[PDB]
Design a protein around this ligand. Structure first.
Ligand SMILES: NC(=O)c1ccc[n+]([C@@H]2O[C@H](COP(=O)([O-])OP(=O)(O)OC[C@H]3O[C@@H](n4cnc5c(N)ncnc54)[C@H](O)[C@@H]3O)[C@@H](O)[C@H]2O)c1
Ligand SMILES: NC(=O)c1ccc[n+]([C@@H]2O[C@H](COP(=O)([O-])OP(=O)(O)OC[C@H]3O[C@@H](n4cnc5c(N)ncnc54)[C@H](O)[C@@H]3O)[C@@H](O)[C@H]2O)c1
Ligand SMILES: C/C(C=O)=C\CC/C(C)=C/C=O
Ligand SMILES: C/C(C=O)=C\CC/C(C)=C/C=O
Lengths: 361, 361
């Protein structure tokens, strides 16, 4: 075909990358019809080979490999950088993004826009070792921390300015999504926990803090992040803006916890007054084998426990509070996409069952 | 003229009534062009006589008076009940609403819809002497309290069902609005407080609780409540629904407090750790004369202190928390109106200065 737009999705197996791969191929999608190149680290997993994306395995931290794999991609119009290296290292994250731009900018003559996805950590700090108060708005100045987001933005602003490309930064809230290859997928994580509770005839027992149980929290659906990125990539009113992305509402983990129990047909144990947070990472230490049994029993897409779940990240979610972000700027710019967070959560569950990452019920 | 729609706005001098009087007369307003009858208790105040509304002074708690004043209004198509009696008495509030319906339903042959405005108290209780947890959604069952909202809804459902009229219930959050004739106008109240602090060379000192300072809160702009009521009154997808109404975002009183100080060019004293709530009602006990001086000095529309301000209500706002409501249902039905609450607050300030209820600066 000829296409209207050609996307390079860096991080296609990711929690947002995998949604963009679906969303960009819908016929109503702005800027369409879209060709999609999808970059990720590992060989194309099976679930993705059944999608119309041109998959490129590439270590994007390796400059020569990245040049050789992406230089030839002359038709690219829009880059969606929806990746990170899996640690908070400013240098290695920065290298990834620089490699992408240095490989594509000089070879793709119709390149228009670079979309960079970071996150609300911008506002409160990093996962190793202060915060702005919320609701977080986009104009809040950088914290004095080595946040790799600062380096990515600086690279973005430099490279796009000197090459007359447009840019956007997206700072999603906690993502409700479906990919089993993510390093930070709260829903799969909690789904795996519940699946194990069920298999071991235990209750869905809440391991988190009191505050996280009771405080207002927010999130974003992966598909909404993809729409928001696509919107900023094609709508000229949105160009060259930093932009938060959340579902537009708030929830409480306590209400989510109940729905999770109901979705797995098991009993729930809520937060208990005075009792304190225990580490779900520690509780799930040596469950790799139970998970390998479950995968085989239900004929699931095979995943290692440490791949599909990130219990450490759940622990952080469950000692967090006061992290609400504002969608006012996006709405004032005309983006009115939203989701009902309770429904988005359930819909991630359904979809992970649908795609056979977790057991049906 | 002939008109497309004819509104009876019961409570036209109110915080929402007064916005409907403006909003219904805009040329782009759904269901327009609109004729507007406006009912309130007192003689038409001066500011309202300069508006194209047919003003009807009527004590709507008096059945015979109400019949004689509203029976002749044969052209009415839509009732907007945006009033209450000023106490929590279930019987006297109920009488008001029944009188309206009994006077209009049998005489207005093209009557289509009755819009009833109650509020988020539905979810947490009454102001004299439990709560549902939030975010509040519309399906939450009634609390076991004598809330006059229950009586108003019961009357609404009975009268509309037996007469093939459509209905809606609107449960606004705390209203950001401009009317000086309201019994519950948080912005005018805080504006009056700041005006007095300024006049007496004092700082804008926060009198409220720690929690109210730091917790997430929400509100609605009066104009947005009017749009939402108008939407439910004309859009067939919205018919016969209970519906919350808020600005679609959240704020904190602490950030609002700072903006309030800035808007009045005075110094702020925020919440002080360990210090506890004092009653602003008590602090403003005998300031009626200072206010009468200020009104005369700045040639303001004359208001009595107890009319324009409701310090008791500010005290309640400042010991409240956990009252967020969800707009998901309205959004899922297609209503995407919203406001930036910080901007809505400032815009109420500006408008009260514009209309000369409070001093310019
Ligand atoms: N997951 C969340 O809830 C969440 C929330 C807010 C912000 N974010 C931010 O979004 C950004 C992207 O994170 P994510 O969670 O979407 O990531 P993810 O873990 O879901 O996906 C990572 C992707 O990057 C690829 N990748 C990693 N190293 C690579 C390399 N050397 N070469 C090529 N590909 C490589 C992976 O294969 C994968 O496709 C991060 O800054 C993250 O902090 C994530
Ligand atoms: N003000 C708020 O912040 C707020 C917030 C949420 C819900 N609500 C609810 O909205 C509803 C309407 O309240 P409001 O705050 O819009 O009221 P308001 O105090 O701003 O207006 C009251 C109106 O009713 C009229 N009225 C009172 N007694 C009357 C009588 N006997 N005859 C004729 N008119 C009479 C008044 O003249 C006035 O126009 C109430 O249930 C209230 O609890 C208010
Ligand atoms: C830990 C937490 C809990 O709500 C929210 C942070 C979510 C993410 C991945 C932020 C990235 O910047
Ligand atoms: C007191 C308060 C503080 O936020 C909110 C209640 C606002 C109103 C008038 C509710 C009516 O049902």
């Amino acid at each position: 075909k000829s296409y209207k737009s050609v996307a390079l999705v860096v991080g296609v197996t990711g929690i947002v990358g995998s949604s963009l791969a679906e969303v960009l191929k819908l016929p109503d999608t702005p800027g369409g019809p879209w060709k999609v190149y999808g970059v990720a680290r590992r060989p194309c997993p099976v679930w993705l080979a059944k999608k119309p994306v041109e998959y490129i395995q590439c270590d994007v931290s390796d400059n020569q490999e990245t040049i050789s794999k992406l230089s030839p991609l002359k038709d690219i119009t829009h880059i969606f950088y929806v990746s990170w290296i899996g640690s908070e290292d400013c240098q290695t994250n920065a290298t990834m993004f620089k490699n992408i731009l240095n490989s594509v900018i000089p070879n793709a003559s119709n390149l228009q826009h670079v979309c960079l996805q970071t996150g609300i950590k911008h506002y409160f700090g990093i996962f190793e070792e202060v915060p702005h108060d919320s609701p977080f708005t986009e104009d809040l100045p950088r914290l004095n921390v080595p946040n790799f987001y600062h380096d990515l933005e600086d690279i973005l602003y430099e490279e796009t300015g000197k090459n007359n490309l447009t840019w956007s930064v997206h700072r999603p809230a906690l993502v409700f999504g479906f990919s089993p290859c993510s390093m930070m997928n709260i829903v799969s994580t909690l789904c795996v926990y519940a699946t194990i509770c069920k298999h071991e005839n235990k209750a869905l027992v809440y391991p988190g803090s009191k505050n996280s149980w009771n405080c207002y929290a927010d999130a974003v659906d992966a598909d909404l992040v993809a729409e928001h990125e696509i919107w900023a990539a094609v709508d000229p009113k949105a160009k060259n803006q930093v932009l938060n992305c959340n579902n537009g509402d708030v929830f409480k983990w306590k209400h989510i916890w109940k729905k999770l129990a109901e979705e797995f047909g098991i009993e729930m144990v809520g937060y208990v007054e005075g009792k304190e947070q225990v580490s779900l990472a520690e509780l799930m230490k040596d469950k790799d084998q139970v998970w390998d049994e479950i995968v085989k029993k239900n004929n699931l897409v095979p995943t290692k426990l440490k791949e599909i779940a990130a219990f450490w990240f759940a622990d952080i979610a469950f000692c967090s509070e006061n992290l609400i972000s504002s969608m006012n700027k996006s709405k004032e710019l005309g983006f009115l996409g939203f989701r009902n967070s309770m429904k988005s959560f359930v819909s991630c569950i359904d979809k992970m069952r649908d795609y056979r990452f977790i057991p049906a019920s």
